[PDB]
Write a protein that binds this ligand. Sequence first.
Ligand SMILES: CSc1ccccc1CC(=O)N1CCC[C@H](CCO)C1
Ligand SMILES: [Zn+2]
Length: 139
Amino acid sequence: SGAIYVGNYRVVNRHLATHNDWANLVWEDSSRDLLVSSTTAQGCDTIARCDCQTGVYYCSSRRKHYPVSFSKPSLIFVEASEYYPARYQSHLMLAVGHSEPGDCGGILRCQHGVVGIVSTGGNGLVGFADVRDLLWLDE
Ligand SMILES: CSc1ccccc1CC(=O)N1CCC[C@H](CCO)C1
Ligand SMILES: [Zn+2]
């Protein structure tokens, strides 16, 4: 679990969004596993605006942060589950690093700020949904 709070917005994994998130929906993209809902309070997370391929992510299944090298956002494969059937996930970045179910929502950060959130992973790999292209989160 986990979310990003920037201004009057809450960014969560679309498969983990609550009834409240859907009742205050701003934007969602099933292919990206993202959903953004509105909030009454002001968020202070800084979104990174860069092309970094190194950063640190929080791994709840180990209560630890890990440094990782990650790929550029791209279209990659995901099987099925209570949430989606096989499809290409867009805007996804992979890194070699520990993850298993429950780890979705952990933040990936670089020196410039928030890069993305854990969304998938498998056999020793972890997948992050990028948020750096969503320029409207700041305005
Ligand atoms: C860190 S998730 C993980 C890691 C290792 C193993 C298994 C998982 C769970 C997982 O991969 N999924 C269930 C939730 C939806 C995911 C796709 C989202 O577009 C797929
Ligand atoms: Zn950066």
